[PDB]
Subunit: 243 residues, 4 copies
């Protein structure tokens, strides 16, 4: 029928905006959630009321664990079950908090910050490609501030750098299969705050979630059919600003 997209952490904030905009563009969507069932279903309700049976929810914890692989397989599968196909994977879900070097157990911090930020994308990518004319692509939510990191955010920063590596390695490896792999790297978007707004060259404010979603839409579209291994910054110039 129409194409189908998986968006991880799609309940709230940036993932919800991505899900909505993909829907508005005529995708059927899987709304993945971990904790936010109420929010996920509510979003699903709003989209199905717009177009019948075009949105489903999918629960999974994306912490790294012996079961992460099974969870990731399940997320992809639920797209194939619901819609008979899977055209787009958006790796949006992400944990974010400090992990000081001069100081949750550390290994929980690893499991969340590397697991959800990098390992789950890699596993989802594997399942997506394993289960594959069409316009197949993956979009990873990266970070424009990766080379100028927040103090005491090493594991977070490590996970986002790993996600860049995944974007590049997967683009190279899946290109022969017609699967494109790209990234979108926000700066300051939806915040945890004017201190940070004032720093942004373009308009002294944060990106809306929808601005982020815009770039995703571009990358999934037929207007990006030659684009793979690209990461588009969406940061209003913040990463250009020196100390």
């Amino acid at each position: 029928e129409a194409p189908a997209a998986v968006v991880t952490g799609a309940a709230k904030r940036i993932g919800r905006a991505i899900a909505v905009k993909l829907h508005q563009t005529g995708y059927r969507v899987v709304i993945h959630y971990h904790n936010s069932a109420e929010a996920a279903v509510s979003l699903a309700d709003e989209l199905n009321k717009e177009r019948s049976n075009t949105a489903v929810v999918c629960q999974a914890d994306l912490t790294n664990s012996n079961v992460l692989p099974a969870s990731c397989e399940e997320i992809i599968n639920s797209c194939f079950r619901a819609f008979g196909r899977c055209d787009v994977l958006v790796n949006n879900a992400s944990a974010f908090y400090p992990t000081p070097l001069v100081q949750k157990t550390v290994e929980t911090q690893v499991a969340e910050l590397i697991g959800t930020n990098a390992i789950a994308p890699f596993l989802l990518t594997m399942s997506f490609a394993q289960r594959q004319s069409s316009n197949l692509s993956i979009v990873n939510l990266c970070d424009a501030m990766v080379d100028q990191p927040c103090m005491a955010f090493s594991l977070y920063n490590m996970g986002k750098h790993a996600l860049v590596g995944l974007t590049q390695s997967a683009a190279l490896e899946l290109a022969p299969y017609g699967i494109r792999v790209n990234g979108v790297a926000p700066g300051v978007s939806l915040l945890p705050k004017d201190k940070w707004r004032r720093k942004v060259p373009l308009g002294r404010r944060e990106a809306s979630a929808e601005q982020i979603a815009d770039a995703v839409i571009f990358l999934v579209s037929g207007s990006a059919q030659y684009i793979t291994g690209s990461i588009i910054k969406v940061d209003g110039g913040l990463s250009l600003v020196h100390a």
Copy 2:
């Protein structure tokens, strides 16, 4: 009225595809050319038949000299003269040829053409664009292969690297005026006219995504996106349109 765009080197190939698609999107266009008089006039005819009074040509050499600033000022002025505004500048015109370090143009001319067209003219057009100032934006045609350059293309590569610096510096400085500055970086696209065919296929086979070069239209698509209302928070960004080519090791 409809917004207006300048596209440098717009008579042929990628610049032509960019002028077309901007036009098809509702822009009035200035078609800058240097030598390609016929092709320039032909394209402006084609666009004007489609919507009258939406296309002009403007002739200018973009080689570095003491009069390059006046030429660049003139390109921008031509947009204001024809359309009363200038919303979009596309820095597309480019000289490209080998300049080996170890050895019929002088080196002073090679510098003038490769650094002038690829970098200095962009800078001067940017200044003139900004001084004469909705959804204002500049798009520089960069090069996805700038960190893995062709052998013996040092001056070309230097110019393209300078264009990256321009993209970042002007993005930062023009942001408070609401002008966004971004780039599109092709890998291998429309292959040179004076090139073989076993040799075109050599380059084609290296491209991971589909073992082929980009169409001009595919490059133009990325330009359209960056000027569009969908890229309003995007500045200082360079989008590679290279089908994975820059990711491939030797």
Copy 3:
């Protein structure tokens, strides 16, 4: 007294070359190893025969697990127990093998080994090195010049080396106030795999612009020596490629 360095995976190859050159420069060294027990003890013996009580060994698996923190803590502790100080940490140990996306070991074991050795262990060692400080302190991470032009089907390895770049920057930033510098050395092609045939070796050699040959272990060690030296006292968050130009060559 003499400064002391920990070098991970120092029994053979590049890690041995680094331990040896640090030793010749006047450092006491901890030779970490995992499986190469014979080669590690042989090296310590050699170094001790040159100046006694200047080399120890230290065994640890650097695979990710709930005990990796303790093992990384123990590596650093081994240096303080032998030498009374720890001045330099070289994160050299590395697992390296294909993990094709389109399909030995389970995937969770591949994650544990490639991400564990290449990134998580460096992070935990960095944390232990910093916390146990209580002079010229620095950390050197062995990165990869080819991280942005990766080998086909090495996604997990590439992810781990990219994470190590992030650690290098993040830790340089966070530890600079403590006087600890953090930098990286990024080989291109160096000591080829012991497994690889000569035919394949020469294919890779011919791609190197500077001399059509791989880096010697010594050449890699040379850059590490620079970064720990007083000649690099203002250098932090820098990653020096030692690749003969390989990363500049297009496809």
Copy 4:
């Protein structure tokens, strides 16, 4: 036979520290200068006092023009005439001032692009054409991706120099000439800058809250020209105390 090095803008500041350290290392040096004749000669006299006939001066404007090629060939020539060889080229000379988008503009172009990029390229061509541990070191800028406001031409020139470093490394590698860069962050601050302004900059540097000494920069240069960097080409070492890692 002692090796020989050309250092551009060697009269003062960083280029002076580079020439001195190369000399201390055993090199004979051509001290290139533009305006600072007295400082250049005074350096040559000091070095020649240390070791007779090991230092000469060479005056040249590195602004872009129809004669820049000739000038750069003559700089390289002076090293061969003086010392019979040229082992090392250090592209250090640089103009630096703002060029806001909103002197004539073409003079700004000629000065900022000429000294920072064109003259390096022409010197590199002349160096290689006249040709063992041969290498070139370009003085780049650690902050090129986080530029000062209204420094576009300066920034463009320094990005061009990165391109040169990479392109020339690749192309000269077959002749055994290595090409590398050193990218300072904040080093010697202007003499005239008020201490209170210097301190705003110093405060931003993670490693020690101070600017690099000229000697710290020269140390990296010494490494890259040494036998300890024999496999290193196309590399750019930041010497910035972590400055480029600091967000807005």
